[PDB]
Each structure stands twice: as C-alpha cells, then as structure tokens.
Design brief:
- Helix 3 (about 150-170) packs parallel to helix 4.
- The protein has helices at about 35-40, 55-60, 150-170, 185-195, 205-210, 240-250, 300-310, 320-340, and strands spanning about 5-10, 15, 30, 50, 70-75, 80, 85-90, 100-105, 110-115, 135-140, 175-180, 200, 220, 230-235, 255-265, 280, 285-290, 310-315.
- A 7-stranded mixed β-sheet has the order 13-12-14-11-15-17-16, with helices on both faces. Strands 6-7-8-9-10-18 form a 6-stranded mixed β-sheet.
- Helix 1 links the parallel strand 3 and strand 4 (about 50).
- The longest helix is centred in the middle third of the chain and has 18 residues, at about 150-170.
- By secondary structure, the chain is an alpha/beta fold.
- The protein folds into 2 domains: about 1-145 and about 295-340, 4-Layer Sandwich (Metallo-beta-lactamase, Chain A); about 150-295, Rossmann fold (3-Layer(aba) Sandwich), CATH 3.40.50.12650.
- It is built from 8 helices and 18 strands.
- Nickel (II) ion binds near residues 33 and 116.
- Nickel (II) ion binds near residues 33, 35 and 94.
- It is classed as hydrolase.
- Keywords: SGC - Diamond I04-1 fragment screening, PanDDA, XChemExplorer.
- It forms a monomeric assembly.
C-alpha cells in the first residue's frame, strides 16, 4: 500500500509510486527520474499514463520496454494541463532527466515536489520566483549539519588533475571509473576529455547513455574497449580483486590502474579537504573515493527552504525512524525561527 507522502491531495496523482499495484484513485503516475528505488515496479506490462521528462521517457521505452502509448513526456519550464490540473516540470540538478514538479491545485494551493535534487541558488530564478508555495515534499537525504561536501566543480578539478598527472607520468596507466545507475557522468567524461580518449564501456551501459540527450555523445563514448584508456565498470568491481582481473583482460597494454569511486558523502568528509584526499593502494592499483554528490548538502538545503518559505514541509527521505523524523522536524523549526516565516 502506497504511503501518504507519495500522494498529491486534491488530485488523482501519485509521485514515484509504481511498486504498490493499482493505486486506488490514481489517474496519472508521475516519475521524477530514472533511479531504481523510484521506478520500482514499472515494466512493459504497465498500462496507466506515466508523466515524466523526455529523457526519462527515452529510458522507460528502451531500458524497461514500457509501450509508447503510455509514455507522456513533458517539456521543462512550460505550463501544461494534466487531467484538468496545471503542472510545471523544473530541472532538479540531480541525474539526467531528473525533475521537480509544481502542482497548481484546483482550490488555489501550490505544491512543489522536489523528487531527488541538489539545491542551487539558480533555482531562485526559475518559475518558482513568481508565486507562493504552500506545501514542499522535500528530498531530505542529507538533512543534518555533519553532511558537508565540496562543489561538483572542485571535485571534477581534483579528478582531472589527478588523472592527467598519473597518465603523463606513465602512459601505460589505465583509468577506470565505477558506475551502477545514471548520474555523475561528468566524472568519466571530464577525465576522458583531458586524456584525449573516448570512454569505453559495455553494450548495456552504452545503450543507457545513448538515451540521455548529451550533446555530441557519439564523439565521447564507445563499446571498443581496445581503443579507449578510460574504462567504465560496475561499482561492485571497483576493488583490488576486480581491478586485478580487469587488467589481465587488457592483453599487456597496461601495467597500472588508477580507479575512481564517486560516492556520496562518507565520514572521511568530516576531517579531510578535497585537496588532501589520498587513495588506497595495493601494488600497481590505486583507488580514490571522491565525494561527488547529486543531493543537497545541509547548507544548500537550508538556503533553498529559507528562500522558498513553505507553510508545510513533508520529508520524502529518512522517514522510517522516529529519531530521523524528530531530528528533521527540529531543523525545520530552527530554519523558520531564524528566517521569520
Ligand atoms: Ni535519485
């Protein structure tokens, strides 16, 4: 049974609610982005209207085989009427195709559902600037002040400088980057651009990337692993055993691996600066964990909410424990007292 925080009151709508069977009263199922915890339940046998971005609809048709007649892609930044209700999709600054949804209820209430997002001051000049929001359904993934991490730009600068130094010292070094979902593509694209290489990967991952509307993508990626010196592997293989095994397969072309694991936050963030990050090393293999986040830090979240000044907040992450729920509620009250709304 579908939980309340996935239902939009005063409508026939649900958000990211495909794992509950037929939801009573639901006339349109929205999907914020193509991550498995959110799409769980969708397949080629789904027969209700799915509303989403163009990029999410490309993934639904090619990866999950949802039939075309049930996919309803909407442009961004554009007022649309869905089953008699005005909606707008906004860029969420998460993975490719990820959106936030503004719903303009028939009674005058305005609701923002963030999906998954990484808040940014640029959102203060979207279509959100133009009217009041009553209710906020908020991605609270990192809603605690211990969760700090650098800008995406600082993390990419570290990765490119690290990779270019290593491969210039040793032209026989291979770079490997871990992946298990869409998102974080800048990591491996930026590294391959500084090295003058295409990124090599499995046929399954190439297919996924070909759905993402990235400009000039045919110039940047390939299934020909022999022609590439930046390889993508599943995240599970980014360990000394898995990398040893991969290096064997490369036919003595390479004699060293430099590997990256883009994580979200890890507790090494509470002590170390990005500049000071060091790898784990075993022989001719080195592994860097880099804190590349596609979710808001605590400070970015707080700034967004203090600007938006919603009347009510409904968390959508960390909702399963009383201690999490009480922590989040205390921060919301702090923010409201400090700002004066
Ligand atoms: Ni996500």
């Amino acid at each position: 049974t579908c939980p309340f925080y996935k239902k939009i009151p005063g409508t026939g709508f649900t958000v990211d609610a495909f794992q509950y069977g037929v939801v009573e009263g639901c006339t349109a199922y929205f999907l914020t982005h193509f991550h498995s915890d959110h799409y769980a339940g969708l397949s080629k046998h789904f027969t209700f209207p799915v509303y989403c971005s163009e990029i999410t609809g490309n993934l639904l048709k090619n990866k999950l085989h949802v039939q075309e007649q049930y996919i309803h892609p909407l442009p961004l930044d554009t007022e649309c009427i869905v089953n008699g209700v005005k909606v707008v999709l906004l860029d969420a600054n998460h993975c490719p195709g990820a959106v936030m949804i503004l719903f303009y209820l028939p009674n005058g209430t305005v609701i923002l559902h963030t999906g998954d997002f990484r808040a940014d001051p640029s959102m203060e000049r979207s279509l959100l600037a133009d009217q009041k929001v009553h209710m906020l359904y908020l991605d609270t993934t990192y809603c605690s002040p211990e969760y700090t991490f650098p800008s995406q730009q600082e993390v990419i600068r570290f990765a490119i400088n690290t990779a270019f130094e290593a491969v210039t010292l040793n032209p026989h070094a291979l770079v490997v980057c871990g992946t298990y979902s869409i998102g974080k593509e800048k990591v491996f694209l930026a590294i391959a651009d500084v090295l003058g290489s295409k990124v090599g990967m499995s046929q399954e991952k190439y297919k996924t990337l070909q759905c993402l509307n990235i400009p000039e993508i045919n110039s940047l990626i390939t299934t020909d692993m022999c022609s590439s010196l930046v390889h993508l592997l599943p995240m599970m293989q980014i360990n000394f055993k898995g990398l040893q095994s991969h290096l064997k397969k490369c036919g003595g072309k390479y004699n060293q691996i430099l590997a990256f694991r883009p994580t979200g936050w890890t507790h090494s963030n509470k002590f170390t600066r990005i500049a000071d990050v060091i790898p784990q090393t075993k022989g001719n293999i080195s592994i860097y964990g880099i804190p590349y986040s596609e979710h808001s830090s605590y400070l970015e979240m707080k700034r967004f909410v203090q600007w938006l000044k919603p009347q009510k907040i409904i968390p959508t992450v960390n909702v399963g424990t009383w201690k999490s729920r009480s922590t989040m509620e205390k921060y919301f009250r702090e923010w409201k007292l400090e700002a004066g709304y």
